Amino acid sequence: QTKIQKYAGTAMPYPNRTMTPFYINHLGRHGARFPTSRKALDKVEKVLVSAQQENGLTSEGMALLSMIRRLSRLFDGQWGKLSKLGETEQEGIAGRMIRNYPQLFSNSAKIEAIATYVPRSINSMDAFLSCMIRHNPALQVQRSEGKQYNHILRFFDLNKSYVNYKEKGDWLPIYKAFVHKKISPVPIMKKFLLNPEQYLDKEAEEFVMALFSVAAILPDTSIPLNLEDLFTLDEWHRYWQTQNLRQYMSKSSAPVGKMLPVAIAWPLLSEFIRSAQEVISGKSDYQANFRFAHDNTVIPFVSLMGIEKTDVQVCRPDSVSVYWKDYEISPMAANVQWLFYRDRDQRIWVKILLNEEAAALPISTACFPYYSWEKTRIFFNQRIEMAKKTLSVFNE
Numbered sequence: 001q002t003k004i005q006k007y008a009g010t011a012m013p014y015p016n017r018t019m020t021p022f023y024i025n026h027l028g029r030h031g032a033r034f035p036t037s038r039k040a041l042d043k044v045e046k047v048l049v050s051a052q053q054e055n056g057l058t059s060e061g062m063a064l065l066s067m068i069r070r071l072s073r074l075f076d077g078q079w080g081k082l083s084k085l086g087e088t089e090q091e092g093i094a095g096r097m098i099r100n101y102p103q104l105f106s107n108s109a110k111i112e113a114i115a116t117y118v119p120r121s122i123n124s125m126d127a128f129l130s131c132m133i134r135h136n137p138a139l140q141v142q143r144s145e146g147k148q149y150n151h152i153l154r155f156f157d158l159n160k161s162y163v164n165y166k167e168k169g170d171w172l173p174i175y176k177a178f179v180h181k182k183i184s185p186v187p188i189m190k191k192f193l194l195n196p197e198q199y200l201d202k203e204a205e206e207f208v209m210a211l212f213s214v215a216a217i218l219p220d221t222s223i224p225l226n227l228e229d230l231f232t233l234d235e236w237h238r239y240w241q242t243q244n245l246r247q248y249m250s251k252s253s254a255p256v257g258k259m260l261p262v263a264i265a266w267p268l269l270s271e272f273i274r275s276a277q278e279v280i281s282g283k284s285d286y287q288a289n290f291r292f293a294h295d296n297t298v299i300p301f302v303s304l305m306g307i308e309k310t311d312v313q314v315c316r317p318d319s320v321s322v323y324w325k326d327y328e329i330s331p332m333a334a335n336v337q338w339l340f341y342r343d344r345d346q347r348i349w350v351k352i353l354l355n356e357e358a359a360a361l362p363i364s365t366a367c368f369p370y371y372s373w374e375k376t377r378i379f380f381n382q383r384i385e386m387a388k389k390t391l392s393v394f395n396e
Contacts, residue, residue, distance in 0.1 A: 001015055001016065003233065003237075004233065004236060005219075005327075006240070006327040007216075007236040007237060007239065007240035007327075008216045008217075008219065008240075008327070009216070009240055009243045009244055009247065009326045009327050010247060010295050010326050010327065010330045010331065010332075010334075011216045011217050011219075011220060011332065012327040012331040012332060013032050013085060013089070013219055013220060013331065013332050014031070014032070014089040014092070014093075014331050014332050014333035014334075015331060015355065017092065017093075017096060017355075017356050019341070020101055020103045020104060020341075021101055021104055021339040021340050021341050021351075022104065022279075022287070022340055022341065022342055023104075023276065023279045023280075023286070023287060023288065023339075023340040024097070024101075024104065024287070024288040024289075024337055024338065024339055024340070025272055025275060025276055025289055025337070025338040025340070026288065026289065026290045026291060026335060026337050026338075027268070027272075027293065027297065027298060027301060027335065027336045028090075028093065028124070028128070028290065028291065028292050028293075028298075028333065028334070028335035028336075029124075029292075029293065029294060029295050029298050029330060029332070029333055029334040029335065030082060030086065030118070030120045030121045030123075030124040030292060030293070030294065030332075030333070031082055031083075031085070031086025031087060031088075031089040031090050031120075031124045031127065031332060031333040032082070032083050032085040032086035032089055032219075032220035032221075032222075032332040032333065033080060033081060033082050033083055033086055033220060033332070034075060034078045034079055034080055034081050034083060034217070034220070034221050035075065035079060035080070035213075035214075035217045035221075036079055036080040037079070038072070038075065038079065039210070040209075040210035040211075040213040040214050041068060041071060041072055041075070041210075041214055043206060043207065043210035044064075044207065044210050044211050044214060045065070045068050045069065045072065047193075047203075047207045048061060048064060048065040048068065049065070051193050051194075052065065055194075056193055056194045056195065057192065057193065057194070058191065058192055058193065058194060060191050060192050061191070061192035064192050064230070067225075067227075068214070070225075071214065071218075071223075074221075074223055075221075078221075080118075080119070081119065081120060081123075082119075082120040082123040082124055082127070083221050083222045084222040085220060085221075085222045085332075086120070086123075086124060086127070086220070086332065086333065087123070087124075087127040088127075089332065089333040090124050090127035090131065090333065091127055091128070091130075091131040093128065093333065093335060093356070094127075094128045094129075094131035094132050095131050096356065097132075097337075098131075098135045098136065101339075104287055105132065105135070105136055105139065105287065105288075106136070107138065108138050108139070108140055109136075109139055109287040109288075110139070110140040110141075110142075110286050110287055111129075111132065111139060111140070111141055111142070111286065111287060111288045111289075111290065112141075112142040112143075112144075112286050112288070112289050112290065113125050113128070113129055113142070113143055113144075113289075113290040113291070113292070114144050114145060114149050114153070114289075114290070114292070115144075115145035115146075115149075115153075115291070115292040115293070116145065116146070116147075116149060116153045116154055116292070116293050116294070117145060117146045118294070121145070121292045121293055121294070122292070124292050124333075125143070125145065125290070125292040128290065128292070129141060129143060129290075145292075149291075151267050152267050152268045152291075153268070153291065153293040153294075153297055154293070154294075154296075154297070155264045155267055155268065155297075156251075156261075156264060156297070156300070158264075159260075159264045159391075160396055161260060161391075161394035161396045162260055162261060162264050164396075165250075165257060165260055165261070166250055166261075169250075169257070170256050171246075171249035171250055171256045171257060174245075174249065174256060174317055175242070175245060175246050175249065178241075178242055178245055178317050178318075179205065179209070179242045180201075180205070182238045182239075182241055183205060183208060183209065183238060183239065183242065185199070185204035185205055185207065185208040186204065187235075188208050188211075188230075188231060188235060189204060189207065189208065191230070209239075211230065212231065212236075212239045214227065215227035215228060215230055215231070216239075220332055240321075240327075241321045243326070244321050244324070244325065244326045245317055245320050245321070247295075247299065247326045247330075248314075248320050248324050248326070251295075251296060251299045251300055252299055252300060252303050252310070252324070253303050253310075253311040253312060253313050253324075254313065254314065254320070255313050255314070255315055258390070258393070259313075259387075259390045260390065260391075260394055261300050262300045262303045262304050262311065262387065262390075263304070263386075263387035263388070263390040263391045264300060264387075264391070265297075265300040265301045265303070265304045265387070266304060266383075266384045266387035266388060266391075268297070268301050269301065269304055269305065269380055269383065269384055269387075270384055272338065273377055273380055275289050276338065276340060276373075277377075279340075280340075280348060280373075295330040295334060298329070298330045298334045298335075298336065299329060301336070302329055302330075302336060304383055304384075304387060305336075305352070305361075305380065305383065306361060306362060306379070306383055307352065307354055307359045307360065307361065308359070308360040308361065308362060309323060309324065310324070310329055328355075329354070331355065334355060335353075335354075335355060335356070336352070336353065336354055337352075337353040337356070338351070338352055338353075339351040339352075339353065340373065341370065347372070348372075348373035348374070349367075349370040349371065349372065349373060350370070350371050350372075350373045350376050351369050351370050351371070352369070352371070361379065363376065363379050
């Protein structure tokens, strides 16, 4: 788990992860994917072609331009698709599940999976389900997807106040000034461009940020090309700090967002609770519910659960990266699993896995990582009521 990989942030590939519950409640981000937009690629290409006609390219700049042109051809028709790596990531997560808990998925167990309408989310769900069925063809499987699940899987598109905050909110100037403070474009552009100092700092900043974006997503495409050495480790460190801050403020518990980015996730936390309550009571006889969606789903959902420190409210932008780390929350294929157990006195316990590692809640338990379900559900219902009160201030 190299330092260079974590600096890819939410573009980091899923990390290496090489008694018996009666129910699993799951939310998983789509696996590693191709870039969704050619804007960054085009920005880099346009700068290098303009410099080539002012004879402003270095030898490395010429090699960079040939490499950008090649990536453009290789990405054509692939934008936003789940990659082969993304497929194998889902197979790894499914495969450890059934290997770790074969009794749960034995005999004729019943599972349900849902996904958004986005193809990479559907393909991720199918990669996961195909691994499941291959290990046990006797499973009973319900498979559905689409805009009917917008309310629980795409709440970030439905809340008018949040949409306005995401596209024009007060986090934007903080982010811009942080980028200006953190990113020094001239040392980077010097490798590629003669006289980078003649570039306006705005243009230079966009070029370097677009180039970082191309380099960060390349390991997710399964294309055997790598661009990490366009930048030093310290430049990747700084780039990651800016992108970590952008994710924190736009999607999580930053004070500037007033917890609006977190509150909008309560319908999914409510559905998690309801589907476990239905299994416990008998209204449902599913052994597992799986859900496939986006990092814009996972990040606020994890904060609203209050998994420790993921909902920290950090006043100072410069301090965020010490306390909140996006690659620890939402790498590619990020996933949350609630594992439910019934002990010898029929009391219900729950373990919370975040990227398959046990997570902590700010409640007490005498046998960590297992929490009383009763205590946990009461705590989550309080988080939901808090979310609704937060949304009452933005009723808009």
